[PDB]
Symmetry: C3
Subunit: 110 residues, 3 copies
């Protein structure tokens, strides 16, 4: 019955919490796409709900982690839905509260 009309989609790439076109990911970030089409993809195409859901879930800020010896390690992406806890420490007390001015994190010294 119907006439099917194809609308080309574009891919959305992610690296380190940030989104990129297929072309930018290949050319700026030096990450190989799945094929020559992705590598040339300037993002002019449409996207699906699932595409957006998946891409957005990958994004986030980058937090510097520390290693087993407490020294600086790699960044980690604090992606959508990622839990973050500000823990009390030796001789300190952490509180995290929510109000009209947003979130307030605080450390007190014991």
């Amino acid at each position: 019955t119907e006439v099917k009309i194809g609308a080309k989609t574009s891919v959305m790439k992610e690296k380190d919490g940030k989104l990129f076109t297929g072309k930018a990911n290949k050319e700026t970030n030096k990450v190989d796409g799945a094929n020559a089409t992705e590598d040339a993809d300037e993002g002019k195409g449409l996207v699906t709900a699932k595409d957006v859901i998946d891409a957005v879930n990958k994004t986030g800020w980058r937090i510097k982690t520390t290693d087993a010896n407490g020294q600086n390690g790699d960044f980690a992406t604090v992606a959508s839905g990622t839990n973050v806890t500000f823990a009390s420490g030796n001789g300190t007390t952490a509180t995290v509260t929510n109000g009209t001015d947003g979130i307030t994190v605080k450390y007190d010294a014991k």
Copy 2:
């Protein structure tokens, strides 16, 4: 004059700062959609600007809050645009600076 050609859209669900298809939200997260269509929605459909704006604004990381007694409480979503303050505390001083390496939060002991 024109011939109207309908393109089916898909919904984007959110839970705790993360996005989900209608089907995933129902089946993995056990949250009822508005109807059977949403509950079966695998995200193959298109989305509007407003859809994306609204969905993206809901996303964010999750921060552990503390209650009126300073004990661990629920997480809260630090959504797009949410203000976060790192406050100085009893015998501590907070500074938050911005540079080429991004943001640096620091607590000094007085």
Copy 3:
């Protein structure tokens, strides 16, 4: 050969880490769009991959910064991909670890 069928797109605006329709940005945020079309744009239109990539990259949470004298300054947007470091300070030690419960930031007093 082909018949070209135009699908109207909608713009996605950003302010302070949050997304808005063209109409909302103009009317609620009081920011001029590029033209009368943007200013009336309710987001019913489609978007491209690049549109979503660019808009999503602008979003993030807002962190209160402190100025050259350590006093409260402006907020800054911690956008997708933005690096955040929790630095050890005078008489304190910062650790940031990653586990099954997500990220845990901690300050110990020396």
